[PDB]
Design a protein around this ligand. Structure first.
Ligand SMILES: COc1cc(/C=C/C(=O)SCCNC(=O)CCNC(=O)[C@]2(O)[C@H](OP(=O)(O)OP(=O)(O)OC[C@H]3O[C@@H](n4cnc5c(N)ncnc54)[C@H](O)[C@@H]3OP(=O)(O)O)C2(C)C)cc(OC)c1O
Ligand SMILES: Nc1ncnc2c1ncn2[C@@H]1O[C@H](CSCC[C@H](N)C(=O)O)[C@@H](O)[C@H]1O
Ligand SMILES: Nc1ncnc2c1ncn2[C@@H]1O[C@H](CSCC[C@H](N)C(=O)O)[C@@H](O)[C@H]1O
Ligand SMILES: [Ca+2]
Ligand SMILES: [Ca+2]
Lengths: 227, 227
C-alpha cells in the first residue's frame, strides 16, 4: 500500500510521472528485487524520483547512505550526482547488495560507490574523531534501523555541512503513528513505532536543523543543517 | 481533508512538523484568509514548510509568483528567501492580496514584492521579447487559474534559468482520476479536471524539464529545467 487516499491516485502518479522516462536500470533492479523475500523494504519509484530531483537541485557531490539493501536508493543516487561523485554506503548484509550490484555496474556508475559491510554506528563514531570529516557531506540518506536514528543524528549533524540535508526515511511508518489503540499491527511495526514517534518529536524540536516532513513513500523527513 | 490515508495522519504531520516550526503569522495570514467572504478554494498548512525548504535549498533570489490571493504562499516565499532578493509577485486580478498585505507588512518583508494587477500572460509576452529576460528567474510558482497553466508554461519555460524549477499547484486536483464517468463529482471540479489531466500529460512529456508530483496539499508538480 501507500500513504495516499487511494492506490489508484498513487498509481496515476507512477504511470504518468515516474515509469515513463526512468532510466531503465531502475526498472531492471526493481525487477530483480521483486524476486527477493524482503522486497517490502525497497524504496518506491516515486520516492527515488524525488531523491533524484533533490540531489540535482542541491548539486550534491559527496554523499552517504545508511541502509543499502539491493541498491535502489543507491543506484538512483549514483545516476543523479556528477561523474566524479562519491557515495559512502553502509549496510550490515552485503549479499543483498551484491544481488543488485550487477545492474549498477551495467549502468556504469558503480565506481562512485564505496560499500562497507557492517553496523553503521561504529563507523560514524570513528569518523567523528577526525575533524577533517566534519561538515564534509552534501547529502546523507538514512534508511536503516529506526531504534538507531536519534543515535545517528548525534554524529550526523556534525558530518553534514551547513549547506545541509539529511534524509530520515519512513517517518510516517505506514501510518501506524496514528493507529487507534486497539487495531493490532505486525509485531515489528508496533516495535519500531515507539522509536519513530520519539524520533519525530526530537527532530521537530532540534535547533540545528530546519526540517520538512514529506508524505512521499512511507514518509521522508528532510533536514537542513543551519548550525 | 487531505489526499493522505487519513485526516489524523495529515494532522500528525502538521501537529509534529508544522505548527511548531511554523513561521510567524503563517497562522495569522492563515486565520485571516479564513475570514475571507468567499473562502472558496483551499489553503494548505503544509505548503509553507515545503516552499521554505525548497527555496532555501536552491538558494532562490530572483523569483516570481503568478496567482496570489491573500498571499499565503507569497508570504512564505518572502520570509524564506534572503532579505536581499526580490519577488516578482507577478499578479492576480482581485485584491485579496490587499486583504493580507497588512500581515506581510506586519512581518516586515513586503519590501521584496513587486505586485502588479491584472492578467500576466501579456506581461510574460513582453518580457520574452527582450532576449535577456530568458533564464533570469530562479523559481516560479503558479497557483493561478488552470486553463492558463499550459499557456503560462509555454512562456515560463524561457524565463527560468538552468535548474529554475517551476512549480504548479493543485496538479492532483483533489483526486482527479475518480471512478470512471459515474462518479458523483461536482461540475465545477469535473470542468477543471480536464485541464489538469491534460496539463499533467503535457508536463510529463516535455523534454525540457524533469518534474516531480509531490503530494503536498492538493498536489504540487515541481519542474526543473534541463534544456
Ligand atoms: C526497520 O524497519 C523497516 C521497515 C520498513 C517497513 C516497511 C513497509 O513496508 S510499510 C508498507 C510498504 N509495504 C506495503 O505497502 C505492503 C504492507 N501490507 C500492509 O500494509 C497490510 O495490507 C493490513 O493491515 P490492515 O489491512 O489495516 O488490517 P488490520 O490488521 O489493521 O485489521 C483489522 C481487522 O482485521 C480483523 N482481524 C482480527 N484479528 C486479526 C489478525 N490477527 N490479523 C489480521 N486481521 C485481523 C478484524 O476484523 C479487525 O477489525 P476489528 O475487529 O478491530 O474491527 C496490512 C498492514 C497487513 C522498511 C525498512 O527499510 C529501511 C526498515 O528498516
Ligand atoms: N545497524 C545497521 N547498520 C547498517 N545497516 C543496517 C543496520 N540495521 C539495518 N540495516 C540495514 O538497513 C537496510 C535498509 S532497507 C531500505 C533502503 C534501501 N536504500 C532501498 O531503497 O532498498 C536493511 O536492508 C538492513 O540490512
Ligand atoms: N488571472 C489570474 N491570475 C492569478 N490568479 C487569478 C487569476 N484569475 C483569477 N485568479 C484567482 O486566483 C486564485 C488563487 S488561489 C491560490 C492559493 C494558494 N494557497 C497559494 O497561495 O499559492 C484562483 O482561485 C482565482 O479565482
Ligand atoms: Ca524506506
Ligand atoms: Ca491552490
Amino acid at each position: 500500500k501507500s500513504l495516499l487516499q487511494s492506490d489508484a491516485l498513487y498509481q496515476y502518479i507512477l504511470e504518468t510521472s515516474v515509469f515513463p522516462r526512468e532510466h531503465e536500470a531502475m526498472k531492471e533492479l526493481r525487477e530483480v528485487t521483486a524476486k527477493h523475500p524482503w522486497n517490502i523494504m525497497t524504496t518506491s519509484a516515486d520516492e527515488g524520483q524525488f531523491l533524484s530531483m533533490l540531489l540535482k537541485l542541491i548539486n550534491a557531490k559527496n554523499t552517504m547512505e545508511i541502509g543499502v539493501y539491493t541498491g535502489y536508493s543507491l543506484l538512483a543516487t549514483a545516476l543523479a550526482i556528477p561523474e566524479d561523485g562519491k557515495i559512502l554506503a553502509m549496510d550490515i548484509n552485503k549479499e543483498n547488495y551484491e544481488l543488485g550490484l550487477p545492474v549498477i555496474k551495467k549502468a556504469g556508475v558503480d565506481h562512485k560507490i564505496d560499500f562497507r559491510e557492517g553496523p553503521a554506528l561504529p563507523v560514524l563514531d570513528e569518523m567523528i574523531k577526525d575533524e577533517k570529516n566534519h561538515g564534509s557531506y552534501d547529502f546523507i540518506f538514512v534508511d536503516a534501523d529506526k531504534d538507531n536514528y536519534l543515535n545517528y543524528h548525534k554524529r550526523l549533524i556534525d558530518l553534514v555541512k551547513v549547506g545541509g540535508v539529511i534524509g530520515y526515511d519512513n517517518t510516517l511508518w505506514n501510518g501506524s503513528v496514528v493507529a487507534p489503540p486497539d487495531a493490532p499491527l505486525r509485531k515489528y511495526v508496533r516495535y519500531y513505532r515507539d522509536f519513530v514517534l520519539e524520533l519525530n518529536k526530537a527532530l521537530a524540536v532540534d535547533p540545528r536543523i530546519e526540517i520538512c516532513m514529506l508524505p512521499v513513500g512511507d514518509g521522508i523527513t528532510i533536514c537542513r543543517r543551519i548550525k
